[PDB]
Amino acid sequence: KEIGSASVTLLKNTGSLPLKHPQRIAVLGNDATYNVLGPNACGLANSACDIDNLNGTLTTGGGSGSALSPYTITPLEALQKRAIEDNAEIAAVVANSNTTTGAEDAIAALLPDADVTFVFLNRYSEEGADAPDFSLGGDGDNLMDLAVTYSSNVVVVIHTTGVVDIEKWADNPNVTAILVAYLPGQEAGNSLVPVLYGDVAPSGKLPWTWGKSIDDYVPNGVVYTDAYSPQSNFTEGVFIDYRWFDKMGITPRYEFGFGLSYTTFTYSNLIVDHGRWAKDYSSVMETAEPFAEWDGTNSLYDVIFTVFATITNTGNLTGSEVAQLYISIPGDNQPVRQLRGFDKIKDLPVGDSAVVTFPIRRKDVSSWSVVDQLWYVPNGDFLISVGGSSRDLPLNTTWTP
Amino acid sequence: KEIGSASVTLLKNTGSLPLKHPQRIAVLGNDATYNVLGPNACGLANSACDIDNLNGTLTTGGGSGSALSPYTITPLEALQKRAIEDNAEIAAVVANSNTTTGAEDAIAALLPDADVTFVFLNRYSEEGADAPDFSLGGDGDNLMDLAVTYSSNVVVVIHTTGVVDIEKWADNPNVTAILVAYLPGQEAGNSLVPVLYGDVAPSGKLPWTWGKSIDDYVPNGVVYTDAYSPQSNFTEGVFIDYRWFDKMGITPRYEFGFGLSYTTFTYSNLIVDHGRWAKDYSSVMETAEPFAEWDGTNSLYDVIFTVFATITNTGNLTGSEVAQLYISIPGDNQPVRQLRGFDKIKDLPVGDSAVVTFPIRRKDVSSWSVVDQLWYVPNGDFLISVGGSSRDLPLNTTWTP
Ligand SMILES: CC(=O)O[C@@]12CO[C@@H]1C[C@H](O)[C@@]1(C)C(=O)[C@H](O)C3=C(C)[C@@H](OC(=O)[C@H](O)[C@@H](NC(=O)c4ccccc4)c4ccccc4)C[C@@](O)([C@@H](OC(=O)c4ccccc4)[C@H]21)C3(C)C
Ligand SMILES: CC(=O)O[C@@]12CO[C@@H]1C[C@H](O)[C@@]1(C)C(=O)[C@H](O)C3=C(C)[C@@H](OC(=O)[C@H](O)[C@@H](NC(=O)c4ccccc4)c4ccccc4)C[C@@](O)([C@@H](OC(=O)c4ccccc4)[C@H]21)C3(C)C
Ligand SMILES: *[C@@H]1O[C@H](CO)[C@@H](O[C@@H]2O[C@H](CO)[C@@H](O[C@H]3O[C@H](CO)[C@@H](O)[C@H](O)[C@@H]3O)[C@H](O)[C@H]2NC(C)=O)[C@H](O)[C@H]1NC(C)=O
Ligand SMILES: *[C@@H]1O[C@H](CO)[C@@H](O[C@@H]2O[C@H](CO)[C@@H](O)[C@H](O)[C@H]2NC(C)=O)[C@H](O)[C@H]1NC(C)=O
Ligand SMILES: CC(=O)N[C@@H]1[C@@H](O)[C@H](O)[C@@H](CO)O[C@H]1O
Ligand SMILES: *[C@@H]1O[C@H](CO)[C@@H](O)[C@H](O)[C@H]1NC(C)=O
Ligand SMILES: *[C@@H]1O[C@H](CO)[C@@H](O)[C@H](O)[C@H]1NC(C)=O
Ligand SMILES: *[C@@H]1O[C@H](CO)[C@@H](O)[C@H](O)[C@H]1NC(C)=O
Ligand SMILES: *[C@@H]1O[C@H](CO)[C@@H](O)[C@H](O)[C@H]1NC(C)=O
Ligand SMILES: OC[C@H]1O[C@H](O)[C@@H](O)[C@@H](O)[C@@H]1O
């Protein structure tokens, strides 16, 4: 559960979250409730259910990295627990909205009087095939169209195996909040509702880039060919995800390492401490990785320096903050920046400050010599940037060894 | 909730209830979960959903006498809460088992390993039409065929507006328990699960007769005609329900006033006390029903005697018991017996005894005189009978005024 509550990521919030004590709650989407055939209906690999089946809350993906469930704690059941505590009413349409007789009529009638409308969306994928685009699973496009027609307070919650296309509605003023919650396992619903009701502020951030379009990603991501010897050439090199997005100058929807809270954090007092170094003595096994500065005592993974910064909860509510550190290694055709540290502060009171610390190892500031076939620390001007996301970096400094 | 717990009526138990702490639980039937269109989707009179809609748990009937619901505490959600406390697993097939791709296979894969299989059945009906027969609503017949195919520990729970036909399954030894929970309103699951698990023994009993066949009841119960002036001739007279079965020598599957407990009760010490009479002063308003014994100072509703009996809990668990009193009023063309009292003893411990008391009013022992146009107490022998149902009557005596 605590994993779910720490992961769930807030992408948009025009004022609707956290919920106070809404009296009339509307829920949309089979994602909000059980698989109609049972949590384990899809079998040993969570891939045997029909393509149109209502599989319910998307708690894991398809294939060999799935597992059986003792139960699922559905969002609806958890939302209901909370409604009942508030002496409120709650109603869910969980059928296929396109194919079920009266579904659309029901939604039209249910939503206008709701204080808030949740829409649960999912996007299953699996081992054995690739997603054909950023397409919402089942009836999700429809759900969303209906929802914004009849309600001005839609809160979208996505259970997905990756980025999905929400371009149609993400800038609709009627969509007041959007959250992704990934694949939260069995404690799906009870990990989420605390966040929505504001018992714990959301603290999770995107572990990849949310581009406005599949066309903004590394070309030829999937090659389709009947050719007896199929060929993908990684001609983009090191430039995947936000590295690609950064180098090409492409603004995504939501950047790598982005995710809102219910409060704001102000960054301050950047500090690089050259005296804060230490030898790697802890790791279980060692590589035979070659590097310039090697002298028979030392390591690629020695922490050469350490960098510090200060966050201040400048908001109105307690909240956790994932601080990120990026470095610009100099060189030719070198990423605009690369993440070389993160430190999550837990539950920072309003007005309070905490120090963020980042141990930079040697390898963290090195390049591969193609010619000499070793790791070496380049010369040049290293940019160090610290902040909230891969594009929210209010503190830079420069280092030159 | 409490009305639900006090009402649910146990019709069969081969040994499977109460549940201890089963580790693997299977659930069958859309009646186990929510209306897929929302609890109030059927609208202002619970009647506007499509004839095949999966309306979920039948918490009330259709028509002017229905009402909106602020939520539904589904059987599935209530059973799951117990599952979780027992560190167990629970899975529900709640689709239409005859029309949903995969449903039947999923049922076949799930049941054989389950420690217990619950099937939730329903039978909607509404103002404006009569049931065409006793058949189960939706896919209930199919669920019951499937269940007894793949599981030897099937427990059946019926949400219904009246008697249904379960003659195919009720004497199948794979059906280990059968309960009817009628129409429990918004607290459907949390009322039922305490009874199954044995936090409270079941104490409800049937408020009508449950015949093997619709053919066993009063003939011409629903007249179907296009005649301009349709006629229903009540030639049966007072002989409806158990009066019909009793007089005509027909054996029901479960008689009027039948319901099992998790313990047994022995009856003793029938006492008819002619000294224990009382004048009627408690009515809010009075009738002007003529009666023969009227002396200006008395009333058809005076209690004229009181009968007592004793019940003892002769089993091994605490139970509540509804004790019933019937009187054979003598005369031409008279019901074999007529209910004239009931008394529910609450939570009688093992070994303990309690006294059951039954005030008998003058009207309770009277007949109407067509010739004289007044009520009178006939001459002859009155048989007074006491017991646990209309056919389980261990105690009797004759009163001859
Ligand atoms: C083919 C394959 O990927 O097999 C394995 C078995 O170990 C492999 C690794 C894989 O992790 C594993 C266990 C999985 O967990 C997958 O999620 C998984 C799959 C990806 C899936 O794979 C497929 O559907 C195959 O492409 C499919 N193959 C073909 O039909 C095929 C024919 C000609 C050319 C190429 C392919 C297949 C389907 C059903 C039974 C056997 C093979 C089979 C498989 O049943 C599962 O496979 C079997 O259970 C199985 C395979 C062969 C014989 C008997 C059983 C699958 C599941 C569980 C559904
Ligand atoms: C016919 C009837 O019972 O009407 C009422 C309106 O007050 C009546 C009392 C009744 O208890 C009440 C409120 C109900 O709650 C019923 O559950 C109820 C019904 C039984 C239902 O009525 C029927 O099914 C009638 O048999 C049905 N009969 C006919 O269509 C019919 C027409 C001409 C000649 C012969 C028969 C009907 C349907 C729809 C509108 C009017 C009549 C209408 C009705 O909308 C509901 O009716 C209306 O809402 C309504 C009726 C007439 C005009 C406008 C609205 C119904 C509901 C709520 C669905
Ligand atoms: C509910 O879960 C189902 C898995 O148990 C899922 O079905 C599977 O969906 C994928 C698409 O994500 C299908 O993928 C394949 O589609 C055709 C196969 O002929 C190929 O062109 C593709 O390359 C791809 O491999 C699976 O076929 C499908 N599995 C089955 C057995 O039908 C449902 O889609 C899920 N429901 C929803 C609404 O998301
Ligand atoms: C679900 O509820 C609906 C009513 O809201 C039921 O459909 C009615 O069923 C009766 C028969 O009992 C028909 O006379 C009506 O025409 C039906 N209503 C409409 C508008 O179609 C439906 O049968 C219930 N579901 C199940 C499976 O019993
Ligand atoms: C001849 C006649 O009036 N009989 C009607 C019948 O036509 C109608 O289908 C049914 C339900 O509407 O109600 C019956 O009373
Ligand atoms: C927003 O919702 C309202 C109903 O509350 C609807 O009238 C309006 O068309 C919607 N607008 C957009 C931009 O979807
Ligand atoms: C991609 O691979 C094909 C297959 O050998 C090759 O002909 C083509 O020139 C390659 N292009 C690159 C590496 O950019
Ligand atoms: C009862 O269940 C078993 C499987 O558990 C099945 O093989 C058997 O045929 C069933 N018997 C009846 C009478 O349905
Ligand atoms: C119903 O009763 C009337 C009056 O006795 C009678 O004329 C009519 O035939 C009866 N209908 C029957 C016999 O079902
Ligand atoms: O119209 C079909 C059906 O309607 C009502 O249920 C009655 O009037 C039936 O006798 C008739 O069969």
DSSP readout, A253-275?
SB-TT--B-SS-EEEEEEEEETT
Classify strands B116-123 and B24-28 as parallel, antiparallel or unpaired.
parallel
Spatial separation of the C-alpha atoms in residues A178 and A258, rounded to whole Å: 13
Query: Tokens 């007529």 map to which residue?
Result: B338
Spatial separation of the C-alpha atoms in residues B190 and B205, rounded to whole Å: 19
Cβ A170 under 6 angstroms from ligand 6: no
Spatial separation of the C-alpha atoms in residues B285 and B173, rounded to whole Å: 53
Spatial separation of the C-alpha atoms in residues A260 and A204, rounded to whole Å: 8
Residue nearest to atom 1 of ligand 9 (CA): B233
Opening angle at CA A189, ends A184 and A190, nearest 5: 100
Burial of residue B346, with CB atoms counted within 10 A of its CB: 0-12 exposed, 13-18 middle, 19 or more buried: exposed
Residues of chain A found within 8 Å of residue B104, distances taken between Cβ atoms: none
Residue nearest to atom 14 of ligand 7 (CA): A235
Residues in CB range of A269: below 8 A, 6 or more apart: A308, A309, A310
Please check whether residue A76 is in contact with residue A27, taking contact to mean a CB–CB distance below 8 angstroms: yes
Spatial separation of the C-alpha atoms in residues A397 and B231, rounded to whole Å: 97
Please check whether residue A242 is in contact with residue A255, taking contact to mean a CB–CB distance below 8 angstroms: yes
Residues in CB range of A388: below 8 A, 6 or more apart: A257, A258, A265, A267, A321, A322, A323, A324
Classify strands B353-361 and B382-387 as parallel, antiparallel or unpaired.
unpaired
Residues of chain A found within 8 Å of residue B85, distances taken between Cβ atoms: none
Residues in CB range of B28: below 8 A, 6 or more apart: B92, B93, B94, B97, B107, B111, B117, B118, B119, B120, B143, B146, B147
The ligand that comes nearest to the alpha carbon of residue B98 is 4
In this structure, the dihedral spanned by the alpha carbons of residues B22, B24, B27 and B32, taken in order and rounded to 10 degrees, is 60
Classify strands B175-182 and B9-13 as parallel, antiparallel or unpaired.
antiparallel
Cβ B127 under 6 angstroms from ligand 2: yes
The DSSP secondary structure of A353-394, one letter per residue, reads EEEEEEEEESGGG-EEETTTTEEE---S-EEEEEESBTTB--
Please check whether residue A79 is in contact with residue A193, taking contact to mean a CB–CB distance below 8 angstroms: yes
Omega before B230 within 30 of 0, i.e. cis:
no
Closest Cβ–Cβ partner in B53, B71, B93 for A38:
B93
Are B71 and A83 in contact (CB < 8 Å)?
Answer: yes
Spatial separation of the C-alpha atoms in residues A281 and A289, rounded to whole Å: 16
Name the closest residue on chain B to residue A70, using Cα atoms: B89
Closest Cβ–Cβ partner in A49, A102, A110 for B53:
A102
Residue B303, SS3 per DSSP: strand
Helix axes A188-197, A75-85, angle to 10 degrees: 40
Which tokens belong to B296?
A: 């200006």
Opening angle at CA B120, ends B114 and B124, nearest 5: 165
Cα A271 to chain centroid, rounded: 28
Spatial separation of the C-alpha atoms in residues A92 and B70, rounded to whole Å: 11
Spatial separation of the C-alpha atoms in residues A375 and A295, rounded to whole Å: 14
Please check whether residue B150 is in contact with residue B108, taking contact to mean a CB–CB distance below 8 angstroms: yes
Q: Resolution of this PDB entry, in A?
A: 2.1
Strand stretches in B103-185, DSSP E:
116-123, 154-160, 175-182
Ligand 6 atom nearest to A173, measured from its CA: 13
Ligand 7 atom nearest to A235, measured from its CA: 14
Query: Tokens 């590394």 map to which residue?
Result: A218
The ligand that comes nearest to the alpha carbon of residue B148 is 8
Rg of chain A taking only CA atoms, in angstroms: 24
Query: Tokens 């609450």 map to which residue?
Result: B346
Are B37 and A88 in contact (CB < 8 Å)?
Answer: no
Which tokens belong to A332?
A: 């030719």
Run of H or E including A304: strand A303-313
Ligand 2 atom nearest to B126, measured from its CA: 17
Spatial separation of the C-alpha atoms in residues B154 and B148, rounded to whole Å: 7
Cβ B218 under 6 angstroms from ligand 2: no
Q: Which of B60, B68, B127 to mutate to test the pocket of ligand 2 (most atoms within 8 A of CB)?
A: B127
Nearest C-alpha of chain B: how many angstroms from A52? 9
The backbone torsions φ and ψ at residue B16, rounded to the nearest 5 degrees and listed phi first, read -85, -15
Cα→Cα distances B338→A139, A155, B142, B247, B331, Å: 59, 60, 39, 11, 13
Q: Which of B31, B49, B57, B59 to mutate to test the pocket of ligand 4 (most atoms within 8 A of CB)?
A: B49
Residues in CB range of A247: below 8 A, 6 or more apart: A239, A335, A336
Spatial separation of the C-alpha atoms in residues A197 and A16, rounded to whole Å: 10
Query: Tokens 């802890």 map to which residue?
Result: A282
Query: How many whole angstroms from A204 Cα to the centroid of ligand 5?
Result: 63
Spatial separation of the C-alpha atoms in residues B342 and B259, rounded to whole Å: 14
Omega before B18 within 30 of 0, i.e. cis:
yes
Closest Cβ–Cβ partner in B37, B91, B93 for A106:
B37
Name the closest residue on chain A to residue B74, using Cα atoms: A77
Run of H or E including B382: strand B382-387
Which tokens belong to B145?
A: 């065929």
Are A70 and B88 in contact (CB < 8 Å)?
Answer: yes
Cα→Cα distances A74→A94, A119, A174, Å: 12, 13, 25
Nearest C-alpha of chain A: how many angstroms from B297? 53
Spatial separation of the C-alpha atoms in residues B20 and B27, rounded to whole Å: 17
Opening angle at CA B46, ends B42 and B52, nearest 5: 55
Query: Tokens 């994602």 map to which residue?
Result: A31
Residue B80, SS3 per DSSP: helix
